[PDB]
């Protein structure tokens, strides 16, 4: 009956930050507030002020001293809050968790409050390539706490404490409409055409759940289909100033099925995205990591019904492609959008330079 809490101490041991959670679920309309408590000894500083900062950054490069193009660190959101000396009571009152932490600690505890705006991306990370070293570009969240006489004062390693949090999303309860698509291709003069119908079973598939596609081919024409290919593609939409869409296949299934002219074909396939065979592909997007733990493929990013903003950070989306191989060109294909989420538990110069550099790298 005792809840857990996460804490991290300063290298000198004087400063410690208490956090009630590490994953802050987004509800598509509001974000769970970042409520915490900072413990500091007044006799230690006795003239400075305690500041806590929330930051989300589009970081590149590794964590330590890389020996190449280092961390382009465009910032998407910066917040500042003062713990000791205290500030006005809002917002709005102190929370229940803050009250319990104050009761557990005493007078030497000072709370802080942060409200994450809705217009922010989720924590993801591009998969590094074998030729590269360390990690690659990926947004992340961070909380810092330090003692200084002003906000512009330089950072101190002996007093500041750095903590890493995450922003996650979960599967909505309401099911979506049935995803289906069709595509017809006629010929030069004959009314004979090439009609195919493809559809999924659901909009939302949990991580690891197989995908069953329903493909119907109406080849009432003269040409012959040799191969059928079903692929699941991942779209990583890097957005800083100019949108860049990157395609990375994650699962492919091929069968040597022949479709005779003036005949139909029906079959149901089974394709499942997973990380075992995509451990060497550049440009793959994974879920944000805490320190170094293994993470699955990046969950789809779903936005509100009225799309006005959130063009920032990295956006992930999945689409299933079904392709028909036709002799002498005439390829016909369809794309079936779907989401992939976990179930709910119970004009700066160097910025343009970096954008061009990333575009040249991944493309």
């Amino acid at each position, epitope marked *: 009956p005792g809840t*857990r809490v996460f804490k991290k101490s300063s290298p000198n041991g004087k400063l410690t930050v208490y956090l009630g959670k590490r994953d802050f679920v987004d509800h598509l309309d509001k974000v769970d507030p970042v409520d915490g408590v900072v413990l500091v000894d007044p006799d230690y500083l006795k003239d400075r002020k305690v500041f806590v900062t929330l930051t989300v950054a589009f970081r590149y490069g590794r964590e330590d001293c890389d020996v190449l193009g280092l961390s382009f660190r465009k910032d998407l959101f910066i917040a500042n809050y003062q713990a000791f000396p205290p500030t006005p009571n809002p917002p709005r009152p102190p929370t229940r968790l803050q009250e319990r932490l104050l009761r557990k600690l005493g007078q030497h505890a000072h709370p802080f409050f942060f409200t994450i705006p809705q217009n922010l991306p989720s924590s993801v990370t591009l998969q590094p390539g074998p030729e590269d070293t360390g990690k690659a570009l990926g947004v992340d969240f961070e909380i810092r706490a330090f003692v200084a006489k002003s906000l512009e004062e330089k950072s101190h390693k002996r007093n500041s404490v750095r903590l890493v949090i995450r922003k996650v999303q979960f599967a909505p309860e309401k099911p979506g409409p049935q995803p289906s698509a069709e595509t017809t291709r006629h010929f030069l003069m004959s009314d004979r055409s090439l009609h195919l119908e493809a559809s999924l079973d659901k909009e939302l598939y949990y991580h*690891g759940e197989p995908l069953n596609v329903n493909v119907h081919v109406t080849n009432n024409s003269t040409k012959t289909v040799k191969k059928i290919k079903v692929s699941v593609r991942q779209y990583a939409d890097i957005v800083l100033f100019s949108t860049a869409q990157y395609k990375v296949p994650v699962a492919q299934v091929e069968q040597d099925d022949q479709v005779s002219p003036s005949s139909t074909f029906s079959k149901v396939y089974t394709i499942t995205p997973f*990380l*075992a065979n995509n451990r060497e592909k550049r440009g793959l997007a994974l879920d944000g990591k805490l320190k170094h733990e293994d993470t699955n493929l990046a969950s789809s990013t779903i936005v509100k019904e009225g799309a006005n903003k959130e063009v920032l950070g990295i956006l992930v989306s999945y689409r299933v492609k079904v392709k028909l191989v036709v002799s002498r060109g005439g390829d016909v294909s369809v794309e079936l959008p779907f989401v992939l989420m976990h179930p709910k538990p119970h004009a700066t110069d160097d910025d343009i330079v970096f954008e061009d550099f990333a575009r040249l790298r991944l493309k």
Partner: antibody
Amino acid sequence: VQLVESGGGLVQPGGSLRLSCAASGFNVYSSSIHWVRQAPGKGLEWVASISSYYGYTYYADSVKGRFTISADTSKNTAYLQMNSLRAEDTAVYYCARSRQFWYSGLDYWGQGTLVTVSS
Amino acid sequence: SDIQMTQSPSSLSASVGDRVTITCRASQSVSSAVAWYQQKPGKAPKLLIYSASSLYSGVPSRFSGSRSGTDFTLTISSLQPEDFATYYCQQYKYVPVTFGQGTKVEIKR
């Protein structure tokens, strides 16, 4: 959901034996299939595990280099291969199952196949 | 190294309707990765508690777990006449996972 397994019996010491666990009712990518053996009259013991999603296999220190675990995703089965069987390798082998996202204990078990080695 | 999971007592005797307490000791600190299984003689184990505090689905509410540092405890409020089996303590935070030594619960006369 059912965890049916077979393939045990009597194997001469130093021989080889192959155990199969035909999982049913769930998926091999969303679950991690573990193997647990129980010595007669003793407690449980962990020997091997496989994670089809990440392609990761782990083994116990007492069975490292002798036991090889593999799975066939198409048939939704897990295979444990025994090599260089010794008198300490006789037990009843179970086929557990734990959620991949995320681990919450071995909530599903098989029925156990008896394995003995004797000259 | 390997985390030894010392479980005591080895065997305890209790009567119907009494309270049964089993303690599990971890040599190294595991946060909450403790699971409690129940194995009747001749059958396969059955998960009862996961995360050292949560009750598994389809399990009577008399079973309950708790954590205190590295001391994990399984408590049964009312000992049902069919709850006489062997209980194990398993940790799954560090590979390899290590089980306990068992705690046989028998009727008292």
